């Protein structure tokens, strides 16, 4: 039912997101306090000591972080937030919270789900900053620190530490601190609103422009977030027309002229965007019956609203008193037709048939069909014949005419016959059985074939039928401009009629007999007279019966009912202007009169691609599904419905349509079901891209980031990857309604999307969709540049890692310590190991050897270099065998590790320290598949230099990679003592360089924090508020 | 998917587009026939009669008598008759006649027999294929209709038929065969292909009347 | 191969009669195009190895040192091929190698060029 | 309204190959498949953030540059003799249906299988493919990209604007329609009338054409700084209140007592700026889009043979041997004669026109170092890979810096009016 209700609406995201904080994800932290206050030092030097607010924190270590919407204030919250927590901490659980299904140890991970895990991370980010940034207000500066600026004020008290962080050239320097240091460098001048929109008359300015602190690329998501809206945009005269267009002039809304106010109407999809999610509605209700039942019955309201025209049961009555006869009879016609009779949402549902003829064909009760299936004696059984005949035209069986001309047959045969193609479809055979077009006999294709003196009725029926078959016509339907087209296999805007259409020209039309319809009512009776009049048939009738059967007959062709004009031309008005407020576009069918050949025979789709065929015309006919069920209906309500159509005594057509539409005219239900498809599609390009990264696809894909390792990927892995984008992507919108459900089925790595069907000559179509563009792909690729770029800070640790000791009194860093102590996998005297290399005990004290990776052996000591995986392998055995040797041994070794996670963990460089310990529980608690974050000891900074003392380490890494510290020592005007590091310029560019450009960028190479931004003040108001119905 | 083809060369009361409908006749034994294509067999024969009886001083009813497709190219197949019966329509243009013999009038019965030896399927002598981008014209072709066309017909200055120009006098039937004239040529052939070729043209064996020796 | 190129003379991949067809020109691809034989491009072949036992006097006269390379000028091309328009009807070739006249004549002044200069050392 | 449908295909110059590498096709076709994308030509910039800077695109031109050579190779497959759409792979692209509609990654055979010899500067009919020809209006959809690409390759120096003057475009309730967008900045209306083009094609005389054109018409001016708040046409006016501006747009504006007199007639013509900054101008290229949307719906007079290159003379679609001039203007001359005009009218003070005048130079000046440090980037690639040569835009020469009678062309425009 969920399907149905799908139809029907979609679930309402939350589109438009306003940020009253700080439009930026990153905050720098402080990491290692300064040795303050100090007896030399006076504390009045600092100016920390009259603990004055800083733009930046003031400590002996500090390093950016990323914190997502860490001071935003929004009105909606999109629930995707990422928090990266100190390297010296362990997030390896979000790390491992994917696919480490065997994974008990916390610290432990698998490498291999690592990729996926940080694409995921990446696209958490976006999902977490998919906001609209409302423009701020300003205030003119009331001191002398700014000359008078304009802030950005927020609502709410203590903004004056946003105020310092914003401009922290608005702090003085009377001292000469790093952090002055760095104020004094930026640009004076580049503060305040940068620029804004005011000039008109009472306009304010719609948008500003403002120099600030921030980030760009959290800025530059919201940038094509809003791109993407502003594509959508529509203006009022435009819907002004659309719904003016609409009503077709039973209704007229009007729009005023006006200078750009800004209103932002974003509802302009492509069509294609529309038909693959039509497509993709027609795959899931595909084979489901009942899913239709419910939707007709809806049509059948909606259509019994509209409608004017009134089922008036009194007409029959009054045919049958004119039925008239004399007591002396035996039997009574005009009881038998009452009986016949045996006595609206049927009528509707058949005429929606009409509209869907292209999924579902109506068919007759079974009961309806006559048990014994006819006899010639019978009356009533010819008034069955009637009834049916009336039916099958109205009826959408192919084989319906020929059904009914056997019908006839079957009744005849024996009395009169025809030439059958074979004995399997005898004359014997059930005329329902003839279901195809090649049961319709040879002989019935060439009437020439019959005698008419042999079989007169017979002939005379194949005659009237070849001369009589009703015309069908077509009808233009639909808005393009605003509504689109919603055709499939037809040309756009046409919708076929049953019958040919010629308009009434009053509005309190007069009955009309010149019907296709009353001619066919007039041949059928005539026909059934001429039978009547049979030489060898009449005998039998008494003359007395034969006057009033022939006059019964006269009277069926003379009845007046308003059915058929009705369904000339007000049927046809009325079709058209629901149409707009179905919730699923029809599906039809081409109509033809006697065009079997091109009857629709097959349907296939195809949501998958051949092994080798690129183009999906050729994969289409073995990669395409079947489709299609029927309708059934009972012919003798309907024919009872044909037989008393009544209009209201007083019909004027243009005052009931234009009263009935006035309330009809309320449908906004489409453009949010656009909205919702175009979400669906912009999920199925991202969940392509993603599976892109993760596998190699008939179409080309790029990967860049591949230096961090990934697992072979099963569709099974795939499935749940592909689940995990499909949770998080309907989290993020808050939406519940089926998305990527037919990708999901089968194996979506080679799936292709296309629909095809075949006619009674076996003459197929298909149908392939072109995607619109999707930001969420651009998004995706420039994060995973700017991942390369900077995985340390993603505290990402790339390279391998040595593991051997090294004591001196200089201060390298465990990430940078000196390259001539440093050797590598090239350096000689250094042994590479291999799966062939085996160890030789030794013996009486001679030397014991172990096997070469080349076969090689001597003792466990000098220069190795040793696989991560082989020491997972046998960490056991290698800590039992080598960990003495590592320890004291002059052994040396560079583990390879390509990714890995790392851990910061700071000592006292006052007091001598030995590493051995921790490194050898790190080695004894590597897993062949898990380890905990690869630890790094770093000494604490200071503020004077001193003499060294002794400490034992045993890890280093293979590139530099401690380019996350942001400052050192700000707190003091001067790193005396430690690393020394400076507030990074590149990351302030724009104030540091005067000369440089506003717009300038660093990326990829480096993420500047101070921005200027654009807020926007554009309006989205309701359509109602500038649109005005006009009765 | 009625499909347009017309006589662009007078517009009754203005340029008409003709759309096939439901309805089609397979009257005619045995084929089954669509209305398109009936009134393209009757343009085209129309057509081939003038050409049989062109009069150098003689007026036509219309320079262009064959209707073309100008839309529903797309349901339309080179193989359908209707292709064909373009490449008719534009030899009878270009003044093509028929090698059978022409009555004034085809039979219902010659028309159906003309119908089944075009149903009789074989490599199209004349080289014209359709093309939707304009109605092609040949460059050395007999009739002034190029120069009458204003809209929508090109002919091609490359495009050169190698074909004389002739008009028969009367072709009535004859009754009974007459001798024909043999001349023999230089080449050279296996006896027992000509056995094979004449098992399949033999029109052996009956019994003929024997006639009188002597008298 | 040995014969000339021919070009539809106006329907293309439906030509049939001989009268579909036409002699494919240059301004197709309007100077002469030629179908270059195996035979000559051997010959050609050799006079360059007699060039090449007179290279040490063309070099110690400083001149023309980068022997001519006759294989480079051949185009080889699909198509319909034929001396006349009736053998291409019924010969459709592929990868015929085809040069210009003037191209082949520059080619030969070359090479007679280098004969006249290397006159005297032989 | 064009009725005639025919490209020709850039040639290389005088280079032996594309100037692409399978890198920067991969680039281009990021994560779609289709190149007919207006968005996949451009990623779509809002201006002053405007403007896609990239290792392989440095400029949103460079960009489309790099679709056109690689749509040059891909569509003479099935523009080939046979115009088979999926038989072989053009540098292992294969179409995926007749309409190409899609392109493919080639089949491992078809990858094995050489890439389509595509010959340089083919002039191509659309009438000769018949599944276009089967669908006008695919056929036109298709065109308004084949149209823009081969404008581009038509000029040899900067590309023109075409500008065209109708009253009959100021009356009608069209003009209110216009209205609509009074208060938006001529990039946003820009942005959302070349939606609705692409969303439906339009009448060449349609309200709509005539609406594009008047908006084409008036940013012009204000650009040239031919129509001002002291120079208003019926009081409207694209309004930028800063010119050299980084994303200076000149927003629709009403002014009182300052109505402009504007000559009667009709005029239309097109204007190709001298400078090469053009690739970092957002505005020209938006101008070059509706231009060559308006090229679709309706066919414009052929340019003069001798205003085109002989080799492109007497193009029957866009080359007549009577023909408009290409009118050649430095941004720079250009902004400095804006400010002329204003300086002459007595709106601005002589000395503010000097300091707009000095902004234009430093940002030329820095502009024009980083196009000739990329120039010598380029140069180093193409010597360190001659197997994978490409051009991260079509080249530039300094000559391209000079104004090149940009006063000469203001004249011309201000004799326009």
Known sequence: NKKTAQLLHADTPRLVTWDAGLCTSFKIVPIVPAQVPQDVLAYTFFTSSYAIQSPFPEAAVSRIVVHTRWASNVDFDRDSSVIMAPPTENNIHLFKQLLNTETLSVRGANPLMFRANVLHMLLEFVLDNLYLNRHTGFSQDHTPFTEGANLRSLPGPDAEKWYSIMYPTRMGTPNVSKICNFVASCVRNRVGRFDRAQMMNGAMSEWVDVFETSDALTVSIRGRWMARLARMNINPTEIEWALTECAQGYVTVTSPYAPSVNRLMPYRISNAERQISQIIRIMNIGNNATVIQPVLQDISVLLQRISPLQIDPTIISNTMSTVSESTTQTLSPASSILGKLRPFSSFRVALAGWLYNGVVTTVIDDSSYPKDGGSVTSLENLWDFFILALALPLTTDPCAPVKAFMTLANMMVGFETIPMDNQIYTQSRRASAFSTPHTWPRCFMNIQLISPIDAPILRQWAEIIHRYWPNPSQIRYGAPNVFGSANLFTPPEVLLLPIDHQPANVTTPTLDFTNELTNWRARVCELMKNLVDNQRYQPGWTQSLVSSMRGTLDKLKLIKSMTPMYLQQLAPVELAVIAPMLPFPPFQVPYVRLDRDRVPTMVGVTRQSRDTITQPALSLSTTNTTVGVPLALDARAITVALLSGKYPPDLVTNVWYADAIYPMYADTEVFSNLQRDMITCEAVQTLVTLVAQISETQYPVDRYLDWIPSLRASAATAATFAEWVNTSMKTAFDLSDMLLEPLLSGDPRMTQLAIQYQQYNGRTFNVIPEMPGSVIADCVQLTAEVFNHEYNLFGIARGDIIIGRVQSTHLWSPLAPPPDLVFDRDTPGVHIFGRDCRISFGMNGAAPMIRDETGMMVPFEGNWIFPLALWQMNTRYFNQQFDAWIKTGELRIRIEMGAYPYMLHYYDPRQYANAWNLTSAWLEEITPTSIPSVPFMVPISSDHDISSAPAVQYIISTEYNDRSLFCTNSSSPQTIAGPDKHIPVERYNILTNPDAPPTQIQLPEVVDLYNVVTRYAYETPPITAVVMGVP | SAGVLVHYDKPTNGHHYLLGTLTQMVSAPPYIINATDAMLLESCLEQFSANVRARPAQPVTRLDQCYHLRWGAQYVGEDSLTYRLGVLSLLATNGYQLARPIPRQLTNRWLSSFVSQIMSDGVNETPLWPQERYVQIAYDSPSVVDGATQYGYVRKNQLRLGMRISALQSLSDTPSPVQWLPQYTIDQAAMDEGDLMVSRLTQLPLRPDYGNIWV | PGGVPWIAIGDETSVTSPGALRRMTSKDIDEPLVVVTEHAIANFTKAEMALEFNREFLDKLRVLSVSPKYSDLLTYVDCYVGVSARQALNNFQKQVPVITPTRQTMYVDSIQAALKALEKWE | ?417
């Open chain 4, 1 to 417: 309204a064009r009725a005639a449908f025919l490209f020709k295909t850039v040639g290389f110059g005088g280079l032996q190959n594309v100037p692409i590498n399978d890198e920067l096709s991969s680039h281009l076709l990021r994560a779609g498949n289709s190149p007919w994308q207006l968005t996949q030509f451009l990623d779509w910039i809002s201006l002053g953030r405007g403007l896609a800077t990239s290792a392989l695109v440095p400029t949103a031109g460079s960009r489309y540059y790099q679709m056109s050579c690689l749509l040059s190779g891909t569509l003479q497959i099935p523009f080939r003799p046979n115009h088979r759409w999926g038989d072989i792979r053009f540098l292992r692209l294969v179409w995926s249906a007749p309409t190409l509609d899609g392109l493919v990654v080639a089949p491992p055979q078809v990858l094995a299988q050489p890439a389509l010899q595509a010959q340089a500067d083919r002039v191509y009919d659309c009438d000769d493919y018949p599944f276009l020809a089967r669908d006008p209006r695919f056929k036109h959809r298709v065109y308004q990209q084949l149209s823009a690409v081969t404008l581009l390759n038509l000029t040899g120096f900067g590309p023109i604007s075409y500008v065209r003057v109708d009253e009959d475009m100021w009356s009608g309730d069209v003009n209110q329609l216009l209205m609509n967008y009074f208060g938006h900045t001529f990039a946003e209306i820009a942005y959302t009338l070349c939606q609705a083009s692409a969303n439906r094609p339009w009448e060449h005389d349609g309200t709509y054409a005539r609406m594009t054109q008047i908006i084409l018409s008036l940013f012009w001016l204000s650009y040239v700084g031919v129509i001002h708040q002291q120079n208003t046409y019926r009081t409207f006016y694209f309004q930028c209140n800063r010119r050299g501006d980084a994303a200076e747009v000149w927003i629709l504006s009403c002014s009182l007592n300052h109505s402009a007199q504007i000559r009667p007639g009709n005029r239309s013509l097109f204007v190709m700026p001298t400078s090469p900054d053009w690739n970092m101008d957002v505005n020209l290229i938006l101008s070059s889009t509706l231009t060559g949307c308006l090229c679709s719906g309706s066919q414009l007079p052929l340019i003069d043979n001798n205003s085109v290159p002989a080799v492109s003379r007497n193009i029957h679609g866009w080359t007549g041997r009577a023909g408009n001039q290409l009118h050649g203007f430095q941004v720079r001359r250009m902004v400095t004669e804006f400010c002329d005009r204003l300086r002459r009218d007595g709106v601005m003070t002589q000395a503010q026109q000097n300091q707009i005048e000095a902004l234009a130079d430093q940002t030329q000046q820095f502009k024009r170092d980083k196009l000739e440090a990329w120039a010598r980037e380029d140069d180093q690639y193409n010597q360190a890979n001659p197997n994978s040569t490409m051009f991260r835009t079509k080249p530039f020469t300094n000559a391209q810096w000079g104004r090149g009678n940009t006063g000469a062309t203001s004249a011309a425009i201000a004799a326009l009016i």
